[PDB]
């Protein structure tokens, strides 16, 4: 037991601006997995495995709101324990 995946739901105007741009590059530095999907209510769901600390390095940008065009209204986080080990990071 080491791997600690987490699910982060981002509210406000996050979908459409292509928020999931640098997510790939950054993810490559950490070597984590997961995916960045979008809800049907205007929100964006981001998931990531590995050590919380390592994951948090790229999440700095999520909680920074890189694209000023976005309107990060709110964001909620929960524990994620998916079955098996994920291959690679991807998108919707």
UniProtKB/Swiss-Prot annotation:
Protein name: Acylphosphatase
HAMAP family the UniProt entry points to: Acylphosphatase_entero (MF_01450)
Field pH dependence: Optimum pH is 5.2-6.5.
Entry keyword annotation includes Zinc-finger: no
The organism's taxonomic lineage, starting at the top: Bacteria, Pseudomonadati, Pseudomonadota, Gammaproteobacteria, Enterobacterales
BP GO terms, sorted: response to heat
Substrates-to-products reaction catalysed: an acyl phosphate + H2O = a carboxylate + phosphate + H(+)
EC number, as in UniProt: 3.6.1.7
Family per record: Belongs to the acylphosphatase family.
Note, other: Has a considerably reduced catalytic efficiency compared to other mesophilic acylphosphatases. Shows a considerable resistance against urea denaturation since the full enzymatic activity is maintained in the presence of urea concentrations approaching 6.0 M and that only a slight decreae of 10-15 % was observed with higher urea concentrations.
UniProt entry keywords in alphabetical sequence: Disulfide bond, Hydrolase
Record's keyword annotation contains NADP: no
């Amino acid at each position: 037991m080491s791997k600690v995946c987490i699910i982060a739901w981002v509210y406000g105007r996050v979908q459409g601006v292509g928020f999931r741009y640098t997510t790939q590059y950054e993810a490559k530095r950490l070597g984590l997995t997961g995916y960045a999907k979008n809800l049907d209510d205007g929100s964006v769901e981001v998931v990531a495995c590995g050590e919380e600390g390592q994951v948090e390095k790229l999440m700095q940008w999520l909680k920074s709101g890189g694209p000023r065009s976005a309107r990060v209204e709110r964001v909620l986080s929960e524990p994620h324990h998916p079955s098996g080990e994920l291959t690679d990071f991807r998108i919707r």
